[PDB]
Swiss-Prot record, chains A, B:
CC annotations in GO: endoplasmic reticulum; nucleus; plant-type vacuole membrane
Stated name of the protein: Chalcone synthase
Pathway it works in: Secondary metabolite biosynthesis; flavonoid biosynthesis
Catalytic activity: (E)-4-coumaroyl-CoA + 3 malonyl-CoA + 3 H(+) = 2',4,4',6'-tetrahydroxychalcone + 3 CO2 + 4 CoA
Keyword Transferase: yes
Gene3D superfamilies (alphabetical): 3.40.47.10
Active site: C163
């Protein structure tokens, strides 16, 4: 009767858990070892000898083996305004991603829902995250329609977020799941690089870095509190806390603008240096309340923005070489899929732990940390607890 | 200690309340009665005599008196590509709104924070919503910087949302405030129509509807659970539940696309008819649990998309003429400010209630409803409880 009684009946009891994970990528892919030749050919830039050498080194140093790409050679031959460094092309780019982003997200979601094993009518919330295009209604609406979810799902559409948003969606889903009894949140991150792909310019080498790193993929979760074992629900990871911060002295480090030529990125500061200089402050804030100071006692998920970020974090913190294994595996096999990447890494970690027969889903350890890194410079920090295997 | 003990200590106890409201608009404004003459003059379209007559009737039927507009005549004279119907112009529009949206949002937020009366360091979360431009980092980052909030504020950037998102930000803020002990959420909705302004055409009259209705404004809230009366916190309204649904048979009713010509809107179905035919189902779902069936016993906030929505809802439900007073006042004095509009209406209602000396902030009544309407067709339904005066 009272507002207080309503509130206590309305909310969930326990911590939010990741109950399922599914992933998907465009079938089409490129092998990084061959990408400099392909990219300089399809962008009609083979005369740019010195710049191609620089790009070969960038691709060789990336540690990426394979990247999935919706964009094909045959399509790009018909679309020279997308192959240019800077030609008016946003309309064509949008036409691609407003369709392909929710379609790829649906492929991941179907896999997540199958693992979860519950009827899709039990989904109560949808969180959709992309940095690839914008539209109204959003990709969240399109996904709801493609999956045939109930019309009364509570949706949140996160557009143009950037590379930290794999942490953001976990932070969002946590509050949605924990504050609503029975809530089951479908989280989807889906990224298609058709809005950022562009040709090379020897006066914009930061733009070239993105052409070596960014790739396509989608990941889907089911998140909920109070799992029901009797119907087959089983958490994989439990969320304990989620934080966000802006790093000091980082203004303008990474900017991204949506313009008539599509999405462009600009780097003005040493991003690996900024992240590694400050990450310990986020670890202390997250884990001092829990009594944890040994960062090698954690299982680790870090957004693989590029190899230098991972290398410099590992050195600064004294992490054992094994801590970044799952993260580096995803970077190697898939590249930087923006917001989806850390969700691929969670999947890789729990699958390897199960295959190996270790004691928990987090490599046999109890506590873990997940980091998103992106424009701001923004750092998202999620504390995770593993589940016994 | 245990994860359950962490969870219960981490979360808030009571329902989320709106603790302060502030609003702002560009000083520049147009009188609707004069707008057909102005619009057809400044777009060099005075030869379109029949179309101007149609637009005059649209403006006269809108019931809008005044609309605030950042875009000035002087600016448009210097930027004739924004006065064409479909000239490339996104870059100019983005240049305007990536700056002016957070600036207007700051103006509203300063007022909300001053009313709230607490130190800005007590803000823990920021929810920024706009349909006017996108950028990375987002307007949420820019607002944090402009106000000097703590760098560790937890931000959520809601881009390209559309007219229902005044309800969405309340739904988001409710879960953030209720699930996090001590959380104080700064919510800002800020809309600048420089992205949608364009010249007239007889190949696209639904764009003309938008040119008659849309206007600029920002609104800011402080939202929190467990108000601290010892420092002067007092809720204005309390949130009880928040729902979202997609109306049946409404596919493609309202679409909006961000293109090289800016943001374009496309209308296909009878929006007032769809809303008025289905709104009772949202009322029943929200209020059957509370034993409430008399919609005239509620105080009302409805998104003023246009006057026909309000008129047809009033007729279909049998509302007394007085129920839509606050909503229609904001429509008349400010126009359709997209997501900010319902927040202006909350402010109008609680200010008029206090001025008139009635018993509660909701026109003397106990229970109320707030609706957002927008692309989908999406209906956001928030149940509110007033506070005694």
């Amino acid at each position: 009767s009272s507002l207080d009684e309503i509130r206590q009946a309305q909310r969930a009891d326990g911590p939010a858990g990741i109950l399922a994970i599914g992933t998907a990528n465009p079938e089409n892919h490129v092998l990084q070892a061959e990408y400099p030749d392909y990219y300089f050919r399809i962008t009609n830039s083979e005369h740019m000898t010195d710049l191609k050498e620089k790009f070969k080194r960038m691709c060789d140093k990336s540690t990426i083996r394979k990247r999935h790409m919706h964009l094909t050679e045959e399509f790009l031959k018909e679309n020279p305004h997308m192959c240019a460094y800077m030609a008016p092309s946003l309309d064509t780019r949008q036409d691609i991603v407003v369709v392909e982003v929710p379609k790829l997200g649906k492929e991941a979601a179907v896999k997540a829902i199958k693992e979860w094993g519950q009827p899709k009518s039990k989904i109560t919330h949808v969180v959709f995250c992309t940095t690839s295009g914008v539209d109204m209604p959003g990709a969240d609406y399109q996904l709801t329609k493609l999956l045939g979810l109930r019309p009364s799902v509570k949706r949140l559409m996160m557009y143009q977020q950037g590379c930290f948003a794999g942490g953001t969606v976990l932070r969002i889903a946590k509050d949605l799941a924990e504050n609503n009894r029975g809530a089951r949140v479908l989280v989807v991150c889906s990224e298609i690089t058709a809005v950022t792909f562009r040709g090379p310019s020897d006066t914009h080498l930061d733009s070239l870095v993105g052409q070596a790193l960014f790739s396509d993929g989608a990941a889907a979760l089911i998140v909920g509190s109070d799992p029901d074992t009797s119907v087959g629900e089983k958490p994989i990871f439990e969320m304990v806390s989620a934080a966000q911060t802006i790093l000091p002295d980082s203004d303008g480090a990474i900017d991204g603008h949506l313009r008539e030529v599509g999405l462009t990125f600009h780097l003005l500061k040493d991003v690996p240096g900024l992240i590694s200089k400050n990450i310990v402050k986020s670890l202390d804030e997250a884990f001092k309340p829990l009594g944890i100071s040994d960062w090698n006692s954690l299982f680790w998920i870090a957004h693989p923005g590029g190899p230098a970020i991972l290398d410099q974090v590992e050195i600064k913190l004294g992490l054992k070489e094994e801590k970044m294994r799952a993260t580096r595996h995803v970077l190697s096999e898939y590249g930087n899929m923006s917001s989806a990447s850390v969700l691929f890494i969670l999947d890789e970690m729990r699958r390897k732990s199960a295959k190996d027969g270790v004691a928990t889903t987090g490599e046999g350890l109890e506590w873990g940390v997940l980091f998103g890194f992106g424009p701001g410079l923004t750092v998202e920090t999620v504390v995770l607890h593993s589940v016994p295997l």
